[PDB]
């Protein structure tokens, strides 16, 4: 609940909002969600803030999650935002990437090289 | 809002008194089983229970009661898992939200005598 995790969750929310218009953030966010087995910043419901996945339009992805949120193909997250959490967790990861990304950064601090 | 906050207060009281109050234990088991949920806000609320908390020295440390399970020993050791692993065995979301929805849906048939 400190500033490091708060900062990481800010970045994750920016990536969620810009998932369709910034390929760099899309790739990074997919790598985090796939690799750390998590969805969103605090929770999978953070994806309601992305206009394509938000439950608010007739678009194909409305009320859905991207496939990098799915447990263990491309439509695996379809409609999951409409579900009760007990149903959703059979299909996608519920907890956000904030906590595991904080743990990852702390573990990898000494091998993060910048040049 | 205040309704859900009140329900989560009650759920946390039941968690704390799970072993010493059979009425709260039964009620909490029935809510967790029936609404498919674990805890008040989340399954990690069980860390506030003296027997299931991971810091306890007893055999049940870092475990959950069976009423939290998706499918008793089904909850043994689940509080130590990462959430992605835990959600394979127990419900992650607390009973606050579904109990709030249940009460709102059934309000009109709630009478008392």
CATH number, domain of B81, equals: 1.10.1450.10
Dihedral of the CA atoms A24, A61, B105, B38 (nearest 10)? -40
DSSP A42: S
Establish if A11 belongs to a structural domain.
yes
Establish if A83 belongs to a structural domain.
yes
Experimental method: X-ray
CB atoms within 10 A of CB A6: 12
Establish if A112 belongs to a structural domain.
no
Establish if B113 belongs to a structural domain.
no
Establish if B78 belongs to a structural domain.
yes
Domain that holds residue A26: 3-104
DSSP A20: T
A3-17 vs A98-108: helix crossing angle, rounded to 10? 120
The residue behind tokens 């990481």 is A8
At A66, is the secondary structure helix, strand, or coil? coil
The partner residue sitting opposite A89, judged by closest CB among B82, B92, B97, is B92
The Cα of A82 is separated from the nearest Cα of chain B by a number of Å equal to 14
The partner residue sitting opposite B92, judged by closest CB among A71, A95, A100, is A95
SS (H, E, C) chain B: CHHHHHHHHHHHHHHHCCCCCHHHHHHHHHHHHHHCCCCCCEHHHHHHCCCCCCCCCCCCCCCCCHHHECCCCCCCCHHHCCHHHHCCCECCECCHHHHHHHHHHHHHHCCCC
Contact criterion met (CB below 8 Å) for B82 and B90: no
Q: What is the domain count for chain B?
A: 1
Establish if A43 belongs to a structural domain.
yes
The Cα A64–Cα A59 span in angstroms is: 10
Q: Does A37 touch chain B (CB under 8 A)?
A: yes
Establish if B45 belongs to a structural domain.
yes
CB atoms within 10 A of CB B10: 17
Query: Chain A interface, mutation test: which of B82, B85, B90, B97, most A Cβ atoms within 10 Å?
Result: B82
At A110, is the secondary structure helix, strand, or coil? helix
Resolution (A): 1.5
Q: Find chain A residues with C-beta within 8 A of B70's C-beta.
A: 86
Closest CA to B24 of B42, B38, B10: B10
Q: Find chain A residues with C-beta within 8 A of B97's C-beta.
A: 85
Establish if B111 belongs to a structural domain.
no
Chain-centre distance for alpha carbon B45? 8
Contact check, Cβ <8 Å, A38/B93: no
């Amino acid at each position: 609940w400190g500033p490091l995790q708060d900062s990481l969750e800010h970045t994750l929310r920016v990536a969620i909002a810009h998932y369709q218009d910034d390929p760099d953030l899309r790739f990074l966010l997919d790598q985090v969600q796939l690799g750390l087995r998590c969805c969103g910043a605090a929770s999978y419901q953070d994806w309601q803030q992305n206009l394509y996945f938000q439950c608010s339009s007739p678009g194909v992805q409305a009320c859905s999650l991207p496939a990098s949120c799915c447990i263990d193909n491309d439509q695996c997250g379809f409609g999951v935002l409409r579900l009760d959490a007990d149903a959703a967790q059979r299909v996608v990861y519920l907890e956000g990437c904030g906590p595991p990304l904080r743990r990852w950064l702390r573990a990898n601090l000494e091998n993060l090289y910048f040049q």
